Design a protein around this motif. Structure first.
Motif, PDB file in Angstrom:
ATOM      1  N   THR A 234      10.835 -27.106 -24.777  1.00 38.56           N
ATOM      2  CA  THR A 234      10.299 -26.764 -26.085  1.00 38.56           C
ATOM      3  C   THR A 234       8.784 -26.935 -26.111  1.00 38.56           C
ATOM      4  O   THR A 234       8.190 -27.569 -25.235  1.00 38.56           O
ATOM      5  N   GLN A 240      18.323 -20.324 -17.923  1.00 43.83           N
ATOM      6  CA  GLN A 240      16.946 -20.354 -18.403  1.00 43.83           C
ATOM      7  C   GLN A 240      15.958 -20.361 -17.241  1.00 43.83           C
ATOM      8  O   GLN A 240      14.984 -19.609 -17.241  1.00 43.83           O
TER       9      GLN A 240
ATOM     10  N   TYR B 237      10.754 -24.911 -30.319  1.00 40.94           N
ATOM     11  CA  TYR B 237      11.379 -23.596 -30.351  1.00 40.94           C
ATOM     12  C   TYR B 237      12.627 -23.606 -29.484  1.00 40.94           C
ATOM     13  O   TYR B 237      12.834 -24.516 -28.675  1.00 40.94           O
ATOM     14  N   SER B 238      13.465 -22.589 -29.667  1.00 47.76           N
ATOM     15  CA  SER B 238      14.661 -22.403 -28.858  1.00 47.76           C
ATOM     16  C   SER B 238      14.726 -21.029 -28.203  1.00 47.76           C
ATOM     17  O   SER B 238      15.613 -20.795 -27.376  1.00 47.76           O
ATOM     18  N   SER B 239      13.814 -20.124 -28.546  1.00 47.69           N
ATOM     19  CA  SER B 239      13.865 -18.757 -28.046  1.00 47.69           C
ATOM     20  C   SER B 239      12.461 -18.172 -28.072  1.00 47.69           C
ATOM     21  O   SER B 239      11.509 -18.816 -28.519  1.00 47.69           O
ATOM     22  N   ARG B 243       8.975 -19.515 -30.157  1.00 51.61           N
ATOM     23  CA  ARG B 243       7.822 -19.918 -29.358  1.00 51.61           C
ATOM     24  C   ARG B 243       6.568 -19.164 -29.785  1.00 51.61           C
ATOM     25  O   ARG B 243       5.508 -19.765 -29.989  1.00 51.61           O
TER      26      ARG B 243
END
Lengths: 506, 522, 527
Positions: A234, A240, B237-239, B243
């Motif tokens: 984050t 990912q 953020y997560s995506s 972001r």
């Protein structure tokens, strides 16, 4: 006499360069204080390694720095002209001609020399950027570094130069050819015929990925990342991996460069799926990848914005001399802004020294740019011997004690045609008097025909006298000569003006 | 402790002075030589400036330290004439040693030196020429620089620096009761070009170029903005979408600042032809906020010393804006041609064609620390030297005519005045003999015969006296015969010679009265 | 095998040497002068102010000084005085030159000015001289000349002693009718056992060997002198047998009777020339000896008898009285004898000396140097040998020069002001005009320095009075007063100098300095 002691000091470095300049020159063994054997003909490498003792030497050495940084040639022309300009001043000093009168004379000759150099122009490179026009200059530049190897090095350079000089037309205000446009690498083993040129970047590090090649499409798109690749962290802390390439390839990317480290799964998966992986220790070389592959480094992680991808024609891993390298290159398109010189050669000194010579050949092409750099002068002391005769004419035209200085000024330009002889092994008691007569003729006309082309024979073709420079196409760069005269004239003026060396308060 | 007597103190002091003279004797005049200063770490200075030489030189003998301290004091008063002092002091002591050995008590000598000092002020007041400061007197002002610069240069920078200093000076002193401040002329140094490429910049040069590839190089008739607040990026953020919003979050505060700036752009010279907008920021500017400035044809600079922009507050004349949220259309200044030149690393911004800020910059160029030091001092010495002309309308015929003609007054008129005394007449003779060291050394350093040139000077002095005319007689160091400094163009300063004669008289008087060298503190 | 200075520092060597000869031979100048001690290593001390002694009898360490000394030795053999002024003039000419040499003036330019000044100096000398009349009433001027030469070489208390001695001595030798004088006719004798103030003038000649017999007459008022060359001692014809004391002398006296017959013939002269007549006397001076009994008979007839005469004084003795040397008493005639006045033999316990005075017509005199010590007799001997030549220079050359340095002082003024206004040289050679005039001050300057008076102030006081003469339109001879401290008039005070000495002093000083200034290299030979 401080000026006498200074003359003694310059005699040391004069002896250094007097036997250095010329294709027939002699090498110097230079032992680095950190334990490196350096054998070269480059006097700039010499003076970089030579510790400076007498402060008057500091003048001459810093003078060669002005020449080498601002012009990619002229190193020995500065040291050679400077050495003799101060040697001949010993006669003027001993005749009773004061330091300020000698200074005034050399400055008066500065004007005479520069005006004559403009008249010595034989030809002019019309800036066709053609291999043939490049060879006219590249050959004599490679000469004085490796005598007789010009055939190998000329084909290497002139073809490499065509890689970094792209198709340009009507372009006199658009600059080209940065010094970093041509990279030279060293592979131990092989010989001169084993050297080649790659149209793009070659990484001296062996292939780090497991993928050899991309697809067959033209302009394989490529990504460079700045942030370290791992599971998406984050924006703040997190106290990912492969999905990156799932994002990258969307636009047409076959090659993925990471300017930082690589996460767990991607190290396997980026290469597993046939995508080249790269991490570069040289960060300027990442700026090179911006120029070679056209890749715009992504400042963020895992987010290859379309504007952050480049287009590179072909990236493969290649084998050079048995030691593996990784090649990020262009191919007949998105033309590479960098070309690599592949030097295979078994002796690490000759291998490195060949690079030192090619480095200078690259620098010469930087002076073959548009800044009034096409002007050609007649080589092999045809410039020097003709200057001798024209300088002595200005002596006849000049009243006063300045006549004595001009006379000794011309004598100084004999050191260059002399050096060409002493290194080549032809009798200086024969070559030099033959040079005088070859250039000193009574022309039935104001334009000397075939008498400005008389040269100095460094070849084994036994002949009484000297040869014609057009036989080998030996021309000198006017800008190199004109700038060198300015540097040496002012540098010698500096030494001639040193009356006392005073230690500062300590 | 230490004690020397039987006049040995006078013998030692003369030895020290004759040495210091022999050091700085060949350093005088346009035919002089250059001296080397060695720091021992390899830094070398090649200079003729006595202010540098006396300050940095290692002085071994303690007597010579006295002259160095005194000469430096003269340097911080008038600003020129350092080697004049050392030469005058040395010959005053040599000419005296001759008379000391003849039985003249040191006090008798020094009293006549003071008597002659009073007389030297009389000749100076009659010998001075008052000039106007009209803008068409560039003839005289050019001659002043051709006098002062010629000494410190190689004769090729004479033609280069002559118009550079002349115009820089006139930019400061208005033709009226104004003022003159040498801090109004900036001295800038740079490499990558030859010494003869030193140029005059109408305005101010900024050393820091921007970091953006499309920065506009040519900006004509533009208003100038100075910002003091950062326009850079000012979180989970997560995506990809979140972001980006976090990056846009702090840059959205910049975005509103940029909106008001591009409103300032559209407001001020947004629709005006042949005009534009320059922005400079004390703090950083976001690379995308630089993309915006490039998008709107705006020149941008960032990360700059406020002191350099403090001059821009005078040069462009705007109001520094601490907050872009308070950005106002009226805070901007005026500028003409703005050029950003590129060297091997940094780019220099030329803020020129400015309304009328009365500030200029001299851009010193050269290859090595050798010549950059030579020119750096040459410009600072020249600007200060010419300032003495605009400060004092009185200009002294140069070429040693002051130091030459004093030999006529001191020898002839004072003997008919009888204003001293019979035994102190010894000192009047000593002073007249020593004032010839200045015209004599100038000849010696040229290679011409030191006696014959003075003889040729005396002949013209006698011809003009018998002709009952005003003739200012000097020394031609090129031909070897006599000249006229008012025709040839050699000028000198009233204030410099006043402090030179009165200073050297005091220096020599102090040294001639030295009785005992007493070592104390040990 | 060569050594020389390619740098001109050879001039620094030559100047350094001259500065030494200055500091050594300068302090002796003037009646305020000091005395130098010469020690010969054998234990003899020569206490002298005389330059010739200090020049010829000094150990010279400097090779350059060898020239200056040997050249100055030629001064005394031409004029007979002035050797100190040469040394001082040379040193200052070289010292003032060193100043101009360091300015870059080639030795030629300096030397040419030295020669140009010599030509100008001859003009001044002829214009500055005072022509003296040949009146024998010049006793006042002649006495004043003696003081000028004596006050230099003696202690000023022997001046009152030696002044009338030298003056009356040269008054005797100087011939009338414009005939010359002969200093070789003036005798100088050395006598010990008296004080230096006892030095005396004798109208005639004094003999060393006196009478050695108790009946020798002390003095003869009116003496008739015989020079006798006949052997009056034991001689024999060119057999003696005695058997007892009685027969010894009978034989020898008979052989000496060949002498005694001449002893009879000598007293036959005495009877022929005033045997018993009053106011007349008979003095015998024999080249050979006199028998002890022949002296007894000479006493019988009251004859002052001398024996064993020195030949050279005997030749003088014929000139002293005008008599003839007698080779045979049989030829002894009454008119051979020479007439003199007071003849007496002064008794000195070492040796009685014979004073033959008031002589017929000798035109010759004797100065008896009296003094007990060797250093005193030498100093006085120089004073007499010098002063006799000083008074000779005046009687030979009627021209006398105002002394006390008026020559060296005024020559300065004339060469300083006129030469450049004459245009008599050149613009560049003016360095020699100044150099010479500045060096002309070494003489008046040294005269003052040795007195203790202020060197600069005394020179200033001299110039002040000389300026008064310019407005006064009169000849004022201004000199240095070495007693009060101010100026004086040499013609009132009585200080005189020689035309010929100053002529050769300036001429020689120019030559010595010119030779040294033109020196380039010092070479080594034979090594």
């Amino acid at each position: 006499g401080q000026i006498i002691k200074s003359i003694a000091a310059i005699r040391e470095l004069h002896q250094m360069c007097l036997t250095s300049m010329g294709p027939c020159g002699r090498n110097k063994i230079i032992v680095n204080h950190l334990g490196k054997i350096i054998i070269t003909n480059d006097a700039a490498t010499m003076l970089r390694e030579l510790d400076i003792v007498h402060p008057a030497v500091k003048v001459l050495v810093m003078a060669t720095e002005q020449q080498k940084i601002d012009m990619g040639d002229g190193t020995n022309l500065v040291m050679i002209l400077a050495g003799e300009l101060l040697n001949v001043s010993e006669k003027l000093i001993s005749m009773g001609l004061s330091a300020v009168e000698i200074i005034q004379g050399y400055n008066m000759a500065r004007k005479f020399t520069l005006k004559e150099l403009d008249e010595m122009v034989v030809g002019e490179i019309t800036d066709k950027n053609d291999k043939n026009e490049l060879l006219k200059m590249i050959k004599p530049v490679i000469s004085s570094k490796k005598y007789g190897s010009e055939d190998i090095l000329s084909e290497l350079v002139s073809e490499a130069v065509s890689h970094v000089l792209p198709v340009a037309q009507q372009a006199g205000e658009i600059p080209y050819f940065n010094v970093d446009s041509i990279r030279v690498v060293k592979i131990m083993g092989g010989s001169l015929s084993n050297s080649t040129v790659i149209k793009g970047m070659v990484f001296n590090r062996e292939p780090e990925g497991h993928v050899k090649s991309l697809s067959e499409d033209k302009k394989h798109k490529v990504a460079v990342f700045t942030c370290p690749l791992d599971i998406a962290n984050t924006e703040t802390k997190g106290t990912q991996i492969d999905a990156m390439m799932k994002e990258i390839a969307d636009m047409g990317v076959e090659c993925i460069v990471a300017g930082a480290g690589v996460g767990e799964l991607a190290l396997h998966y980026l290469n597993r799926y046939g995508i080249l992986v790269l991490k570069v220790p040289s960060k300027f070389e990442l700026r090179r990848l911006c120029r070679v592959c056209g890749a715009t480094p992504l400042p963020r992680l895992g987010a290859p914005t379309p504007e952050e991808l480049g287009l590179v024609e072909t990236v493969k891993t290649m084998e050079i001399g048995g030691d593996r390298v990784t090649v990020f290159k262009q191919e007949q398109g998105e033309i590479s802004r960098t070309s690599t010189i592949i030097l295979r050669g078994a002796t690490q000194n000759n291998l490195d020294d060949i690079e030192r010579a090619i480095d200078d050949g690259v620098a010469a092409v930087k002076g073959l740019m548009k800044p009034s750099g096409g002007k050609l002068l007649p080589g092999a002391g045809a410039t020097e011997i003709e200057l001798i005769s024209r300088i002595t004419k200005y002596g006849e035209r000049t009243p006063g004690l300045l006549q004595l200085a001009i006379k000794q000024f011309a004598v100084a330009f004999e050191v260059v045609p002399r050096t060409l002889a002493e290194t080549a092994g032809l009798d200086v008691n024969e070559v030099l008097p033959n040079l005088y007569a070859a250039h000193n003729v009574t022309e039935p006309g104001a334009v000397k025909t075939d008498h400005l082309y008389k040269g100095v024979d460094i070849d084994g073709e036994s002949d009484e006298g000297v040869k014609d420079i057009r036989e080998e196409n030996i021309y000198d760069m006017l800008a190199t000569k004109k700038f060198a005269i300015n540097v040496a004239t002012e540098a010698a003026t500096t030494v001639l003006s040193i009356d006392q060396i005073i230690m500062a308060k300590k | 402790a230490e004690s020397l007597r039987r006049d040995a103190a006078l013998k030692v002091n003369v030895t020290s002075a004759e040495g210091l003279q022999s050091v700085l004797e060949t350093n005088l005049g346009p035919k002089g030589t250059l001296k080397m200063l060695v720091d021992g770490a390899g830094n070398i200075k090649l200079t003729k400036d006595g202010k540098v030489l006396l300050t940095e030189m290692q002085i071994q003998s303690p007597t010579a330290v006295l002259i160095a301290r005194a000469a430096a004091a003269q340097d911080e008063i008038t600003g020129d004439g350092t080697t004049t002092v050392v030469c005058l002091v040395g010959e005053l002591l040599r000419q005296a040693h001759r008379f000391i050995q003849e039985g003249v008590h040191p006090r008798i000598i020094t009293d006549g030196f003071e008597i002659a000092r009073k007389e030297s002020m009389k000749f100076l007041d009659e010998f001075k020429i008052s000039k106007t400061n009209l803008s068409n007197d560039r003839e005289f002002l050019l001659q002043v620089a051709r006098s002062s610069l010629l000494t410190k240069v190689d004769a090729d920078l004479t033609e280069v620096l002559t118009p550079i200093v002349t115009d820089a000076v006139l930019s400061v002193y208005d033709a009226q009761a104004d003022n003159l401040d040498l801090h109004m002329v900036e001295i800038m140094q740079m490499q990558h070009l030859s010494p003869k490429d030193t140029t005059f910049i109408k305005g101010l040069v900024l050393d820091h170029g921007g970091r953006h590839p499309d920065m506009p190089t040519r900006v004509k008739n533009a208003y100038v903005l100075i910002l003091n607040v950062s326009l850079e990026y000012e979180f989970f953020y997560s995506s990809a979408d979140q972001r980006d919003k976090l990056a846009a979050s702090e840059r959205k505060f910049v975005d509103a600042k940029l909106k008001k700036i591009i409103d300032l752009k559209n407001e001020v010279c947004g629709m005006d032809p042949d005009k534009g907008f320059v922005i400079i920021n004390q703090k950083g500017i976001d690379p995308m906020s630089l993309d915006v400035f490039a998008k709107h044809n705006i020149l941008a600079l960032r990360r700059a010393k406020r002191r350099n922009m403090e001059r821009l507050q005078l040069v462009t004349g705007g109001e520094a804006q601490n907050s872009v949220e308070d950005l106002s259309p009226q805070i901007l200044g005026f500028s003409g041609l703005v050029y950003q030149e590129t060297i091997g690393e940094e780019k220099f911004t030329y803020v020129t064609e400015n309304t009328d800020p009365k500030s200029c910059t001299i851009l010193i160029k050269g290859s090595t620390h050798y010549a950059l030091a030579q020119t750096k001092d040459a410009v600072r010495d020249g600007l200060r030297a010419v300032a003495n002309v605009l400060k004092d309308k009185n200009i002294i015929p140069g070429a040693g005519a002051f130091y030459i003609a004093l030999s006529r007054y001191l020898r002839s008129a004072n003997m008919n005045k009888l204003g001293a005394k019979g035994k102190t007449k010894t000192g009047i003779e000593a002073f007249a003999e020593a004032l010839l060291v200045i015209p004599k050394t100038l000849v010696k350093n040229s290679g011409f015969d030191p006696l014959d040139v003075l003889a040729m000077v005396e002949d013209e002095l006698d011809d003009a006296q018998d002709s009952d005319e005003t003739r200012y007689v000097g020394v031609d160091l090129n031909i070897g015969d006599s000249c006229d400094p008012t025709i040839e163009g050699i000028w000198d300063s009233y204030r410099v010679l006043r402090n030179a004669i009165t200073g050297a008289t005091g220096i020599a008087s102090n040294l001639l009265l030295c009785d005992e060298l007493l070592r104390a503190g040990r």
